[PDB]
Amino acid sequence: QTILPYPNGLYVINKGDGYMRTNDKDLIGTLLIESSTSGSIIQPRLRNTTRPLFNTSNPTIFSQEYTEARLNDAFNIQLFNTSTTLFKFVEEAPTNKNISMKVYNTYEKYELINYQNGNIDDKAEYYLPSLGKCEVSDAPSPQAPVVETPVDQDGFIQTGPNENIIVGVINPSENIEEISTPIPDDYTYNIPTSIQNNACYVLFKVNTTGVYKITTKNNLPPLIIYEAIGSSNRNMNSNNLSNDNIKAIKYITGLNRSDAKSYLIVSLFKDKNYYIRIPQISSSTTSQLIFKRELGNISDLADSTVNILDNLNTSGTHYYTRQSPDVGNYISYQLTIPGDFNNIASSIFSFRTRNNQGIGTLYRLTESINGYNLITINNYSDLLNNVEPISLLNGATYIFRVKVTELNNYNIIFDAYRNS
Amino acid sequence: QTILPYPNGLYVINKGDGYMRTNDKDLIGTLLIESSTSGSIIQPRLRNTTRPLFNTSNPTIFSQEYTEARLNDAFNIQLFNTSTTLFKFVEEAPTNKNISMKVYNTYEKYELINYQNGNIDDKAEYYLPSLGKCEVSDAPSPQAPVVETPVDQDGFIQTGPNENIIVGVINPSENIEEISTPIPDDYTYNIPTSIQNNACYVLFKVNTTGVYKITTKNNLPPLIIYEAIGSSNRNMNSNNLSNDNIKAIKYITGLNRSDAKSYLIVSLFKDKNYYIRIPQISSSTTSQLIFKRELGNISDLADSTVNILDNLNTSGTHYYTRQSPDVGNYISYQLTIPGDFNNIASSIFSFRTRNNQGIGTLYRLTESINGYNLITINNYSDLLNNVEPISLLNGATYIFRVKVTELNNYNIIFDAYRNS
Amino acid sequence: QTILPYPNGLYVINKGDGYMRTNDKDLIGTLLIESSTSGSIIQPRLRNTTRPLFNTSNPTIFSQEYTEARLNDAFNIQLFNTSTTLFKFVEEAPTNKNISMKVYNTYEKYELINYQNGNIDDKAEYYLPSLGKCEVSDAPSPQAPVVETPVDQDGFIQTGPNENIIVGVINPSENIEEISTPIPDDYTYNIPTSIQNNACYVLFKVNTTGVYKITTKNNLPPLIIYEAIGSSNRNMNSNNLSNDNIKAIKYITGLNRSDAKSYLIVSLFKDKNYYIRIPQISSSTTSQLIFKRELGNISDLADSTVNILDNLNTSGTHYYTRQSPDVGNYISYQLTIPGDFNNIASSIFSFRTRNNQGIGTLYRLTESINGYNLITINNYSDLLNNVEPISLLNGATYIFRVKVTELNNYNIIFDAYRNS
Amino acid sequence: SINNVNLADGNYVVNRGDGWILSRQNQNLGGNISNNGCTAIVGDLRIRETATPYYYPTASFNEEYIKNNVQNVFANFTEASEIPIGFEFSKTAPSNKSLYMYLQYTYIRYEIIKVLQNTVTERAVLYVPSLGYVKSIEFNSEEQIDKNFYFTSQDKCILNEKFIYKKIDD
Amino acid sequence: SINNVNLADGNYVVNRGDGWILSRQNQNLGGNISNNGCTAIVGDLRIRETATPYYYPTASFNEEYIKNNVQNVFANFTEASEIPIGFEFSKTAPSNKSLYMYLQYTYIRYEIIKVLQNTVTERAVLYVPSLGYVKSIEFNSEEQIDKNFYFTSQDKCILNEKFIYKKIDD
Amino acid sequence: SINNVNLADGNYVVNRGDGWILSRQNQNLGGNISNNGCTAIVGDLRIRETATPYYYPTASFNEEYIKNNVQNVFANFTEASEIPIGFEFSKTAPSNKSLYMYLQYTYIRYEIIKVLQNTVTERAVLYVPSLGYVKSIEFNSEEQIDKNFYFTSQDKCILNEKFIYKKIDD
Numbered sequence A, B, C: 001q002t003i004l005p006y007p008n009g010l011y012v013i014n015k016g017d018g019y020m021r022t023n024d025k026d027l028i029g030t031l032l033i034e035s036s037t038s039g040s041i042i043q044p045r046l047r048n049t050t051r052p053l054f055n056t057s058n059p060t061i062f063s064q065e066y067t068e069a070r071l072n073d074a075f076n077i078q079l080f081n082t083s084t085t086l087f088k089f090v091e092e093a094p095t096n097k098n099i100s101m102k103v104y105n106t107y108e109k110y111e112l113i114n115y116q117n118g119n120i121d122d123k124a125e126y127y128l129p130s131l132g133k134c135e136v137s138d139a140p141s142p143q144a145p146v147v148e149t150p151v152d153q154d155g156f157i158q159t160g161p162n163e164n165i166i167v168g169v170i171n172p173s174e175n176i177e178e179i180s181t182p183i184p185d186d187y188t189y190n191i192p193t194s195i196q197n198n199a200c201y202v203l204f205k206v207n208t209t210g211v212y213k214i215t216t217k218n219n220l221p222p223l224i225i226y227e228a229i230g231s232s233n234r235n236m237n238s239n240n241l242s243n244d245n246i247k248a249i250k251y252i253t254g255l256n257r258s259d260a261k262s263y264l265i266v267s268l269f270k271d272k273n274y275y276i277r278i279p280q281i282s283s284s285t286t287s288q289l290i291f292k293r294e295l296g297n298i299s300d301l302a303d304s305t306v307n308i309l310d311n312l313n314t315s316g317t318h319y320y321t322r323q324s325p326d327v328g329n330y331i332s333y334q335l336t337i338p339g340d341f342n343n344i345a346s347s348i349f350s351f352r353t354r355n356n357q358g359i360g361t362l363y364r365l366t367e368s369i370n371g372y373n374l375i376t377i378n379n380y381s382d383l384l385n386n387v388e389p390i391s392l393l394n395g396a397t398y399i400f401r402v403k404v405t406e407l408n409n410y411n412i413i414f415d416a417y418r419n420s
Numbered sequence D, E, F: 001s002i003n004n005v006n007l008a009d010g011n012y013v014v015n016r017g018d019g020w021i022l023s024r025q026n027q028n029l030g031g032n033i034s035n036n037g038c039t040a041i042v043g044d045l046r047i048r049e050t051a052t053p054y055y056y057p058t059a060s061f062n063e064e065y066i067k068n069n070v071q072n073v074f075a076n077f078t079e080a081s082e083i084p085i086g087f088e089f090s091k092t093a094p095s096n097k098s099l100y101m102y103l104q105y106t107y108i109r110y111e112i113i114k115v116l117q118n119t120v121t122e123r124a125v126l127y128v129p130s131l132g133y134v135k136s137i138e139f140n141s142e143e144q145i146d147k148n149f150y151f152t153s154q155d156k157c158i159l160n161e162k163f164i165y166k167k168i169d170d
């Protein structure tokens, strides 16, 4: 019941270790260790068989076998129902008292989810057999008065430290395309016809580390870019892209929203591999993927989706609903002021957001024979309640950057209020 | 070579742990552990095979298989020639000297005996493989002068702590009868015809905890009652007796002696199971077992056999030989004084014992519409040498209780000396 | 590259433990043990298979199988490629730092050599799998600057303590003869015809401990005597020699040199077994082995070969090249002075050595009806540079004993300089 | 007595707790003897082949009924029995005396009770093999030992007993 | 960057050192939980059936080429894999708090590099199963833990990295 | 010498004691090397397949005669050999130096003697595998070691020798 700032797709969440069922259903045993004595409980693996626990909201597709394959893509887990890993606990009772040693089997809880438009449509919980838990305490009195107690509710409880690690995986039903040659400063890729049938991922790497602008020729549809987790510093060839079938992906930036006309500004390192996910294009006209290495302080947009705002030639509110970046991340908006350019002529604007809070930076986009350049016009320490207006030259282009500071809703709404 | 205060039957005696043969026949090995070093000897059970030792005075009946079955009835031992129980010894030598570590296999000695009339007619000794013994001491000098020594006598020696635990078992050749319904305050049971062919046991439980009088309608033959060891607090039904096939029995009270006309006064708890052993009745007339819950201080006879004395209408000694109870236990005698009742009329008596010593209590048996009642007439702190006579009303009934304090002989002799 | 003072034959040299290959080829693994934690690496022998390393200069004869058989004769090694011996290392990191635990497999290096006339004609190196090595040290910094380092040279390095244990073995291609009866004070043995085809060994024991003179009837060829290592205090019979097939031999004294006319004076103990190696005799006339227990101070020649000097009837240098005894051991020379005996008449001599240094003792050999006797004439603390001459009675016999103090060459040269 | 329960009428499955040792089975696995500061160690593996359950059924509750109702609410011992589990105890013998320790299996006691008028009318019992427990005593061949040390006449719990229930349905 | 090597032109096999843990495989073997001064122990056996190598080949260097060139200069891991080897870690939980430790395999990183103009042009990588490494942290159900403790996004060496080379011939 | 016994005339079976190590077999099982406070551990299992007896028969006493007469009076080693038994030794290496320890089997020496005129006329010998013994020494690659540490030329007993006899009948 919390906001998950990620694009549509599959995710595997390591929800922590130390999970066990209620009513001692995972109790291995208890030892009464008398003073000056030592007790020990062992899982020697004389048999390597382990018993995983599985729960799914859709048996047909999110089957145990399917879920296991996802866990393999996320964390590369090899053994699901066997183990050669031994665990053992040892305790010595003091000279003054007796000790009670309770030992239980445990599980690591992995959650597999199908996340669509801020919502979970399917869910599976895989409990990977773990290395147990041991509770030692002062031995109870054999005389302690017995208290009738109703059995607890059927279920799990967490015993290990708090953990929540999200890892995205390539959607196995969307194909993967590959740009074999490390891309240079400029590159154009023709999107295959299969795009008409389903979204695909384009795997690639850059020849030179730096910031890049990535987009379709009409800034439509919106793109999403990921990093192949663990891809850096493995096999490498200067003239070819060495694939490692890494299906674990880290979301950098991008949106799913259909009408979100935009392009991406991201930081790319040559020693890594990346995936760009192109939505399904239900059109017969061939689309293209354009890559361009940007020199200049356009890098300030450091890993951001730049939304091009439409219909700015009116007065009042101008809203834009977009999937909100996570706390600390960016989301940008490009504005070409209505009217013709002649330094003097201007219009008054007031920038705000509505669901989520953040820090704003207003840039004046300029041109040079050395690429683009940004000139900071102003900064805003409060966007949810900003009232300070500002005048912008007509026919000029501005980019507003938002750094999310408070994630209250799945979507963040941007408002380019035109006072005049 | 000591008195065993128990009725005829079978017994399994745990004679202790740490038994081993002479001349190092059970030596596993010796380790020379030099200073600042640690040594260890282990029985890891890479093979679960163990080798029991057996000796019997009658191979035909008291076979190893038979003996093992008895040990199972007594202590419920499951594994006789295998073990998954590991034992290991560890010792660290000080910085100043060397240590010698000798480790031996050991056995727990169980004795199976056929006990008849104060005598052992058959005997078997079962040596159950145990968990070893370890002797550490200062390492001997390699230069120590060698002393010619003759081998010791072939046999066993005990190394563990002193132990002697007697447990009786149902004689497997005498059938078991069962009184299915928990007996109420009054109950009569007809003894089956099979009684003509051999003794039997009658299994039962009481519906109400309290003291009971148990006997045959003519006080013949004498009965014996046992407790089913471990029978309390297991399966239970208020309308039925739940059997646990417990063949381990704890002797409460009773005699074997044929002419011992008597009845039993015992304390019975409803949460337990009991066995009454009825001797073989070589008669065609059906006998009966009568149960009667006694209210009153007749409970003072707390677990005792009440012997009814015969031929009291003469002068002088009146001896009665009976199997002696153990130190601390009782044996009672009922006396109806010869002559007619008329308060005043009396006769002088002097109570004594001859083989064993004990504490005596003389009771006057009275009647009430609330059952019986006892009135203490006198107590005797010495029965072997009592000379203090006492006058008893003729036609009145007295019960004398003996608490054994010294067990010198299998039989205790009671003497109701009539001075007048 | 050092002098090996032994006769021709086979030898197995334990060159030490802790041998391992370069470039971590025997590294089992490294553990990073963090402070307050304990780490352990184990060779549990879940599989008893071990992998020996072998190198030979002659695959045809000194094969691995052959070499293993020799190692069995030398040290009685049973298992070459399997082991049930477990080894394990444990280390606890202090509270202040991290520890690095590196563990490697190791080998004991056994060298098999065919030694002929001060030279090694064939050589094999057998690396017996050992019980590992563990190196613990302060954990290195993960930030430590990486230094390009060229791989070391392919090979072995020794990690265990310095060790060099030489053990000779019966040459398996020379047959063994046996003198069944313990030899008395005098004994003559006829050398079999097989001697014409190859050298043989004669196994025997003496009935009485003491010093013995052993030789062929013409003092030719030279003999060599060994002790059967471990032969003492095992099976024994006063009328027969109990063989233990001990093929491990300890060289006592003797030469290989063909023209070395001589006899042996050695100390023999009845509880031991000995081997006399008779060279191949390429003659059709039967030779003999004569044994004679010597009483007297002839025992002073305690384990020595007595070389009979020839051609002493000239002036100047009189050299004699013989295989040098080891530092601390003897080598003797018998001299009968040229000329007839008549107390007074004498000749001047000056004794020296040339390659090796030693201590000399000059004895006057005399006769008695109680055997021989020696009279010390003089001692020399320096033989390499001795100039002190001495006059010896003509027709008299002298024995010069040399105790090697410096082993510079395989051969020691003796010089009986005749000044007159 | 022990049949008085503040429970509605019906059938219940009860977890009586872990740590139950059985009547007179005290020395069935043997004992161990050591001395002079030596460390003694005894252990075992409750392999499915040895660790066998003890059923004490009644008219209303048979073996099958007891098992399914226990494995439904509490730990499924039939499944777990396929995976070997070990336990051990160790103790150091006194400097100048002997130490004797013996081992015995512990159990989890489950009960199936029939309640009527706040009283137990019927009671089935199940003992599921848990782990083990050792008892030790110091001695010398002269010392006299209390026989309660070697023998347990009535089933009992070495830990505190428990009463965790759940009413059975249908 | 990491492709600059002061090496003559040619192909080389390099030992990058022992102690390499792999990306996001941190908790694949499970974790262990203990408390109040109890000693926790976790261990494993790199049996040939589990300990499997990870090959990352390139055009010039295929799986076979990488293996033979590594087993020729450095430890022959194919042979050694037939002999089971164990390792364990133990730690004592704090007196009044909980301890959590998890295990993961360590590796030896080998590289096959193609050098041109003192720069790496091609790089193949091989990870040979070595032993294991544990990470521990003390905690209570409230504490917040740094996720770097549970996750490793990029392959790294817990010990100091190494560069021990040998030029390949023919 | 060692053949003088104050015994009546006849044949005897003698237990010469446990703790016998054999000639030059010192390093047959290999050695172990550690350093800087590390704890080294070596152990073994005298499995029936390895632990093999060494017979040294004479004319009067053959292998069979020796075995039956020993297993009749003393421990029956043929039976016991079917049950695996282990032993181990452990030692901590010095803080700033190296430790080397090697293992070898120990034995029980049995003898079958023929006595005449208070002197041993014939002597058969049997060595029954017992357990093991380790020897350790601290060192550095420079130190010179006494070769008696690595080699035993004559069978001997690391414990005190014994002479426990029983005259053989018929």
Ligand SMILES: CC(=O)N[C@@H]1[C@@H](O)[C@H](O[C@@H]2O[C@H](CO[C@]3(C(=O)O)C[C@H](O)[C@@H](NC(C)=O)[C@H]([C@H](O)[C@H](O)CO)O3)[C@H](O)[C@H](O)[C@H]2O)[C@@H](CO)O[C@H]1O
Residues within 6 Å of the ligand: A117, A256, A257, A258, A259, A260, A261, A308, A309, A310, A311, A317, A318, A319, A320, A321, A322
């Ligand atoms: C996943 C996906 O396809 N996106 C879904 C949305 O399309 C869908 O809502 C869409 O709303 C559209 C109109 O919404 C605004 C907005 O952003 O809030 C209305 C603004 O006034 C308008 N801005 C101006 C000043 O013109 C703004 C803007 O045109 C766009 O953001 C593009 O820049 O659109 C429209 O009605 C679509 O038909 C409708 O689908 C939401 C549900 O509301 O679900 C998303 O998953």
Ligand SMILES: CC(=O)N[C@@H]1[C@@H](O)[C@H](O[C@@H]2O[C@H](CO[C@]3(C(=O)O)C[C@H](O)[C@@H](NC(C)=O)[C@H]([C@H](O)[C@H](O)CO)O3)[C@H](O)[C@H](O)[C@H]2O)[C@@H](CO)O[C@H]1O
Residues within 6 Å of the ligand: B117, B256, B257, B258, B259, B260, B261, B308, B309, B310, B311, B317, B318, B319, B320, B321, B322
């Ligand atoms: C196991 C069994 O059947 N009992 C055997 C005895 O019956 C048997 O001895 C019996 O002795 C009987 C007579 O003995 C006395 C006695 O108790 O000592 C003699 C007393 O004077 C007599 N008391 C009086 C005053 O009458 C007493 C008494 O009648 C009975 O105890 C009954 O109350 O009997 C008789 O001779 C039997 O024939 C004889 O079997 C003994 C061996 O002596 O072995 C028991 O096993």
Ligand SMILES: CC(=O)N[C@@H]1[C@@H](O)[C@H](O[C@@H]2O[C@H](CO[C@]3(C(=O)O)C[C@H](O)[C@@H](NC(C)=O)[C@H]([C@H](O)[C@H](O)CO)O3)[C@H](O)[C@H](O)[C@H]2O)[C@@H](CO)O[C@H]1O
Residues within 6 Å of the ligand: C117, C256, C257, C258, C259, C260, C261, C308, C309, C310, C311, C317, C318, C319, C320, C321, C322
């Ligand atoms: C293994 C074997 O058979 N021995 C080989 C030697 O025989 C061989 O050298 C031999 O040398 C002989 C002559 O050498 C001297 C000597 O000992 O140095 C020369 C001395 O002047 C002579 N002494 C005197 C005063 O007569 C000395 C002496 O005669 C002998 O030692 C016997 O007492 O001999 C001769 O030339 C042989 O033909 C020759 O084989 C050496 C190589 O030089 O190799 C050995 O293996």
